[PDB]
Amino acid sequence: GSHMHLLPELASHHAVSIPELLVSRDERQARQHVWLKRHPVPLVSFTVVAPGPIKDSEVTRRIFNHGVTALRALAAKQGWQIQEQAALVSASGPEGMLSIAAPARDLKLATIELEHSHPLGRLWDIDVLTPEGEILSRRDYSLPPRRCLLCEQSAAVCARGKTHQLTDLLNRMEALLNDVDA
Ligand SMILES: [Zn+2]
Protein backbone atom coordinates (compact mmCIF):
# COMPACT_ATOMS: atom_id res chain seq x y z
CA GLY A 1 0.00 0.00 0.00
CA SER A 2 0.90 3.67 -0.36
CA HIS A 3 -0.54 7.15 -0.09
CA MET A 4 -2.57 7.82 -3.19
CA HIS A 5 -2.61 11.65 -3.62
CA LEU A 6 0.08 12.85 -6.07
CA LEU A 7 1.20 16.45 -5.47
CA PRO A 8 0.55 18.16 -8.84
CA GLU A 9 3.54 20.54 -8.74
CA LEU A 10 5.85 17.53 -8.33
CA ALA A 11 4.88 16.15 -11.76
CA SER A 12 7.94 14.62 -13.41
CA HIS A 13 7.02 15.56 -16.99
CA HIS A 14 8.80 12.36 -17.95
CA ALA A 15 8.89 11.93 -21.74
CA VAL A 16 7.64 8.43 -22.62
CA SER A 17 8.95 6.73 -25.74
CA ILE A 18 6.93 4.38 -27.93
CA PRO A 19 8.77 1.17 -26.85
CA GLU A 20 8.75 2.38 -23.24
CA LEU A 21 4.94 2.55 -23.35
CA LEU A 22 4.72 -0.86 -25.04
CA VAL A 23 6.94 -2.48 -22.40
CA SER A 24 4.91 -0.84 -19.62
CA ARG A 25 1.71 -2.63 -20.65
CA ASP A 26 3.34 -6.01 -20.02
CA GLU A 27 4.74 -4.74 -16.71
CA ARG A 28 1.29 -3.48 -15.73
CA GLN A 29 -0.33 -6.84 -16.44
CA ALA A 30 2.30 -8.59 -14.30
CA ARG A 31 1.79 -6.06 -11.49
CA GLN A 32 -1.99 -6.55 -11.65
CA HIS A 33 -1.53 -10.30 -11.32
CA VAL A 34 0.70 -9.83 -8.27
CA TRP A 35 -2.06 -7.82 -6.59
CA LEU A 36 -4.67 -10.45 -7.48
CA LYS A 37 -2.50 -13.10 -5.82
CA ARG A 38 -1.79 -11.03 -2.69
CA HIS A 39 -5.50 -10.18 -2.24
CA PRO A 40 -7.75 -12.58 -4.25
CA VAL A 41 -10.53 -10.00 -4.67
CA PRO A 42 -11.38 -7.83 -7.70
CA LEU A 43 -8.83 -5.17 -8.62
CA VAL A 44 -9.40 -1.62 -9.80
CA SER A 45 -6.58 -0.45 -12.10
CA PHE A 46 -6.99 3.30 -12.69
CA THR A 47 -5.22 5.57 -15.19
CA VAL A 48 -6.18 8.91 -16.70
CA VAL A 49 -6.49 10.11 -20.26
CA ALA A 50 -2.97 11.36 -20.97
CA PRO A 51 -2.34 11.98 -24.65
CA GLY A 52 1.09 12.58 -26.07
CA PRO A 53 4.56 11.78 -24.81
CA ILE A 54 4.40 13.55 -21.42
CA LYS A 55 1.83 11.71 -19.32
CA ASP A 56 2.78 12.83 -15.78
CA SER A 57 1.79 16.52 -15.72
CA GLU A 58 0.12 18.90 -13.29
CA VAL A 59 -3.12 18.36 -15.23
CA THR A 60 -3.03 14.56 -15.18
CA ARG A 61 -2.17 14.53 -11.48
CA ARG A 62 -5.08 16.86 -10.72
CA ILE A 63 -7.41 14.63 -12.77
CA PHE A 64 -6.03 11.52 -11.04
CA ASN A 65 -6.46 12.99 -7.56
CA HIS A 66 -10.17 13.65 -8.19
CA GLY A 67 -10.53 10.04 -9.34
CA VAL A 68 -8.93 8.67 -6.18
CA THR A 69 -11.43 10.65 -4.12
CA ALA A 70 -14.37 9.42 -6.21
CA LEU A 71 -13.30 5.77 -6.12
CA ARG A 72 -12.95 5.84 -2.33
CA ALA A 73 -16.42 7.41 -2.07
CA LEU A 74 -17.81 4.73 -4.41
CA ALA A 75 -16.40 1.92 -2.27
CA ALA A 76 -17.83 3.44 0.91
CA LYS A 77 -21.26 4.06 -0.65
CA GLN A 78 -21.49 0.51 -2.02
CA GLY A 79 -20.26 -0.89 1.29
CA TRP A 80 -17.14 -2.61 -0.08
CA GLN A 81 -13.87 -2.79 1.87
CA ILE A 82 -10.65 -1.62 0.24
CA GLN A 83 -8.08 -4.24 1.27
CA GLU A 84 -5.07 -2.46 -0.24
CA GLN A 85 -4.48 0.64 -2.33
CA ALA A 86 -1.52 2.44 -3.86
CA ALA A 87 -0.54 5.01 -6.43
CA LEU A 88 2.50 5.22 -8.67
CA VAL A 89 3.70 6.98 -11.80
CA SER A 90 4.18 4.62 -14.75
CA ALA A 91 4.73 5.12 -18.47
CA SER A 92 0.96 5.70 -18.64
CA GLY A 93 1.22 8.54 -16.10
CA PRO A 94 -0.49 8.47 -12.70
CA GLU A 95 -1.73 4.99 -11.94
CA GLY A 96 -3.83 3.72 -9.04
CA MET A 97 -4.49 0.19 -7.81
CA LEU A 98 -7.20 -0.83 -5.35
CA SER A 99 -7.99 -4.36 -4.17
CA ILE A 100 -11.70 -4.21 -3.26
CA ALA A 101 -13.67 -6.95 -1.47
CA ALA A 102 -16.65 -6.58 -3.83
CA PRO A 103 -18.42 -8.78 -6.40
CA ALA A 104 -16.46 -8.20 -9.60
CA ARG A 105 -19.49 -7.61 -11.83
CA ASP A 106 -21.02 -5.17 -9.31
CA LEU A 107 -17.73 -3.28 -9.11
CA LYS A 108 -17.39 -2.90 -12.89
CA LEU A 109 -21.01 -1.76 -13.18
CA ALA A 110 -20.42 0.81 -10.43
CA THR A 111 -17.26 2.17 -12.09
CA ILE A 112 -19.09 2.39 -15.45
CA GLU A 113 -21.73 4.52 -13.75
CA LEU A 114 -18.99 6.65 -12.16
CA GLU A 115 -17.26 7.21 -15.51
CA HIS A 116 -20.59 8.32 -16.97
CA SER A 117 -21.95 10.49 -14.16
CA HIS A 118 -18.93 12.25 -12.62
CA PRO A 119 -18.04 15.54 -14.37
CA LEU A 120 -14.46 14.30 -14.89
CA GLY A 121 -15.41 10.67 -15.61
CA ARG A 122 -14.67 11.12 -19.32
CA LEU A 123 -11.00 11.53 -18.39
CA TRP A 124 -10.78 8.34 -16.28
CA ASP A 125 -9.81 4.84 -17.47
CA ILE A 126 -11.05 2.58 -14.67
CA ASP A 127 -10.34 -1.08 -15.36
CA VAL A 128 -11.75 -3.87 -13.20
CA LEU A 129 -10.12 -7.31 -13.11
CA THR A 130 -11.59 -10.47 -11.61
CA PRO A 131 -9.30 -12.58 -9.40
CA GLU A 132 -8.76 -14.90 -12.38
CA GLY A 133 -7.34 -11.94 -14.35
CA GLU A 134 -10.41 -11.39 -16.56
CA ILE A 135 -10.68 -7.78 -17.73
CA LEU A 136 -14.37 -6.88 -17.54
CA SER A 137 -15.97 -4.79 -20.30
CA ARG A 138 -19.12 -2.84 -21.14
CA ARG A 139 -19.59 -5.40 -23.93
CA ASP A 140 -20.04 -8.16 -21.31
CA TYR A 141 -23.37 -6.53 -20.37
CA SER A 142 -24.30 -5.48 -23.94
CA LEU A 143 -23.74 -1.85 -23.01
CA PRO A 144 -22.69 0.71 -25.63
CA PRO A 145 -18.93 1.24 -25.97
CA ARG A 146 -17.14 4.16 -24.37
CA ARG A 147 -17.58 7.37 -26.35
CA CYS A 148 -14.75 9.48 -27.70
CA LEU A 149 -13.81 12.41 -25.49
CA LEU A 150 -14.46 14.87 -28.34
CA CYS A 151 -17.41 13.39 -30.27
CA GLU A 152 -20.27 10.90 -30.05
CA GLN A 153 -18.55 8.08 -31.89
CA SER A 154 -16.78 5.28 -29.98
CA ALA A 155 -13.39 6.14 -28.49
CA ALA A 156 -11.91 3.01 -30.07
CA VAL A 157 -12.56 4.02 -33.65
CA CYS A 158 -11.55 7.67 -33.12
CA ALA A 159 -8.33 6.44 -31.52
CA ARG A 160 -7.61 3.98 -34.35
CA GLY A 161 -8.54 6.60 -36.94
CA LYS A 162 -6.37 9.29 -35.26
CA THR A 163 -9.32 11.57 -35.88
CA HIS A 164 -8.63 14.35 -33.39
CA GLN A 165 -5.65 16.64 -32.85
CA LEU A 166 -3.46 16.06 -29.80
CA THR A 167 -3.77 19.75 -28.89
CA ASP A 168 -7.56 19.51 -28.93
CA LEU A 169 -7.55 16.55 -26.53
CA LEU A 170 -5.17 18.32 -24.13
CA ASN A 171 -7.24 21.51 -24.28
CA ARG A 172 -10.44 19.64 -23.46
CA MET A 173 -8.72 18.18 -20.40
CA GLU A 174 -7.80 21.67 -19.23
CA ALA A 175 -11.31 22.96 -19.86
CA LEU A 176 -13.02 20.16 -17.91
CA LEU A 177 -10.61 20.66 -15.01
CA ASN A 178 -11.32 24.40 -15.04
CA ASP A 179 -15.07 23.69 -15.12
CA VAL A 180 -14.91 21.56 -11.95
CA ASP A 181 -12.16 23.50 -10.11
CA ALA A 182 -13.48 26.99 -10.79
ZN1 LIG B 1 -14.12 11.42 -31.77
User: Alpha helix locations (H) across 118-181?
Assistant: 155-160, 166-180
**Distance between CA atoms of residues 153 and 82, nearest Å:** 34
Which CATH architecture group holds 8-143? Answer: 2-Layer Sandwich (3.30)
Q: Which CA distances in Å does 112 have to 74, 125, 144, 163? A: 11, 10, 11, 24
**Distance between CA atoms of residues 66 and 173, nearest Å:** 13
Method: X-ray
* CA of residue 114 to ligand 1 center, whole Å: 21
Write the DSSP assignment of 78-94 as a string of letters: HT-EEEEEEEEEETTEE
* CA of residue 163 to ligand 1 center, whole Å: 6
CA dihedral of 141, 145, 149, 155, whole degrees rounded to 10: 140
The neighbourhood of ligand 1, an ion, using CB within 5 A, equals 148, 150-151, 158
How far out from the chain centre does Cα 100 lie? 15
Closest to 47 (Cα-Cα) out of 14, 79, 89, 107: 89
**Distance between CA atoms of residues 79 and 54, nearest Å:** 37
* CA of residue 38 to ligand 1 center, whole Å: 39
* Strands 43-48 vs 93-101: parallel, antiparallel or unpaired: antiparallel
Resolution in A: 1.7
